Amino acid sequence: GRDEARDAYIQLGLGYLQRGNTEQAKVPLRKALEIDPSSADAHAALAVVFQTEMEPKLADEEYRKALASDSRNARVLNNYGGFLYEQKRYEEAYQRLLEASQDTLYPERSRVFENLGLVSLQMKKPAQAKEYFEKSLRLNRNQPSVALEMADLLYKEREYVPARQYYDLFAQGGGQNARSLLLGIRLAKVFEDRDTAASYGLQLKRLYPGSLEYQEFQAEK
Amino acid sequence: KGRDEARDAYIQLGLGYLQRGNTEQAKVPLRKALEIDPSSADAHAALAVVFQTEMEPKLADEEYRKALASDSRNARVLNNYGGFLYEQKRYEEAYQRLLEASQDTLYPERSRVFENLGLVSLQMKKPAQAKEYFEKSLRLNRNQPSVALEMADLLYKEREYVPARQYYDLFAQGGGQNARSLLLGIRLAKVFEDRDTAASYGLQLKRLYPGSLEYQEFQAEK
């Protein structure tokens, strides 16, 4: 057929998937595949469908089919990498992410670098992780989640001043959690900021009354 | 610290023998470096090319791996190893080592890393991907006739004659020419109705590569 039709069908499938209906999304995706059996995007969309229907082996197959095409696959590589990650296939996830990072035109390139840092952490390679988080920030400094990873790593290495800078950077994204609040409390205390320590503690004591962090906060309080 | 001074010196002596073509002699100095520092990545790496040069792939592979055990992210060694893997036709592994090599953006020869990613892509039957890698290599180092030639060939095959010709001319102003490139230049001249070069290249080709498949095709007025 033609790319327009194929692409129209692919988005139809996505729209359905991007809203829970996966058994359905499959009909427009398969139409896309009838038009272009090699469509990397059609196969990738299908991979995410099976991935959603907790069918790992089917998802892996679709992802590999999409990678077989000689097209710009950074997005596909990044999603496959995420998939390999939850499948605990870390070394593989890392390789696909390295390949996804090659595309400088890809809008999510800095997220690809964040993912490289994340996977490096799972592999117990903190030093390369830091490097990857730093590369992500060099592309775009305003990514709270990445700054949080930097703050956490620097904090564990006792490099408190740089850690605080990154934590402050993360804090202006206003997206706390048990982990971020506890890191905030601990940093606040190194810099003797009782106001922040007390404040975050409440958000913790209130938003995550049960969490281990709350316990630690209580014990370090 | 003194021990590192002698080790480094021996590694340089070894690389000098290699560079001078005395491949086998390079081993003496390199084993000394290794006797001083059993885990020296640069000594293992140099020994690796000694073996690679002597067509002893098992030994070369083992030395490349020992060199990377030390520092698994050393771009120079990752690139030499991926280059080795490419020659051994172990494309998946070459690609993987080269992808890791590409991450050191301060590596002076990063342009070579991208050239290698492009060549490996060719063998994986992904010419559009090879092209992107080749363009990255030329952006980092414009003066690479061999990369310009691979670009010219790809563009020619894509019917993108003007960009093809452009890259070809850049390759030509670099010296070399072989059966392959003479034929490519001949076919490009024909497209841009340049009878002079077409007849001239066909000359160098009949003269220097009379037994090549390229000359055979040329005669078929190809």
Instruction: Note the Cα A35 to chain centre separation in Å.
Output: 32
Method: X-ray
Q: B103 at the A interface (CB within 8 A)?
A: yes
Comparing C-alpha atoms, which of B134, B136, B117, B185 is closest to residue B156? B185
Comparing C-alpha atoms, which of A68, B115, B49 is closest to residue A76? A68
Task: Count up the domains in chain A and report the number.
Answer: 1
Q: Which residues of B40-53 are buried (b: 16+ CB within 10 A; e: fewer)?
A: bbbbbbbbbbbbbe
Q: The domain containing residue A149 runs over which residues?
A: 1-221
A102/B99 CB distance under 8 A: yes
Comparing C-alpha atoms, which of B101, B170, B145, B90 is closest to residue B123? B90
Alpha carbon distance B70, B34 (integer Å) = 13
Long-range pairs, A79-87, Cβ under 8 A, ≥24? A79/A44, A79/A47, A79/A48, A80/A44, A80/A47, A81/A112, A81/A115, A81/A119, A82/A115, A83/A47, A83/A51, A83/A59, A85/A115, A85/A118, A85/A119, A85/A122, A87/A56, A87/A60
| Contacts B126 to A, Cβ<8 Å | 70
Residue-level length of chain B: 222
Comparing C-alpha atoms, which of A49, B208, B203 is closest to residue B218? B203
DSSP state of A71: S
The data reach a resolution, in angstroms, of: 2.0
Q: In which residue are the tokens 């906060």 written? A: A217
A70/B102 CB distance under 8 A: no
CATH code of B186's domain:
1.25.40.10
DSSP calls for chain B = --HHHHHHHHHHHHHHHHHTT-TGGGHHHHHHHHHH-TT-HHHHHHHHHHHHHTT-HHHHHHHHHHHHHH-TT-HHHHHHHHHHHHHTT-HHHHHHHHHHHTT-TT-TTHHHHHHHHHHHHHHTT-HHHHHHHHHHHHHH-S--HHHHHHHHHHHHHTT-HHHHHHHHHHHHTTS---HHHHHHHHHHHHHTT-HHHHHHHHHHHHHH-TTSHHHHHHHTT-
Q: Which residues of B2-11 are buried (b: 16+ CB within 10 A; e: fewer)?
A: eeeeebbebb
CA-to-CA dists, residue B171 to A142, B144, B145, B184, angstroms: 43, 8, 4, 11
A29/chain B closest Cα distance in angstroms: 25
Alpha carbon distance A114, B18 (integer Å) = 42
Amino acid at A55: E
Comparing C-alpha atoms, which of A108, A112, A110 is closest to residue A139? A110
In contact, A28 and A13? CB cutoff 8 Å: yes
CB-closest option in B96, B102, B126 to A70: B126
Q: In which residue are the tokens 């870390």 written? A: A90
Distance, first Cα to last Cα, chain B = 64
Instruction: Note the Cα B62 to chain centre separation in Å.
Output: 21
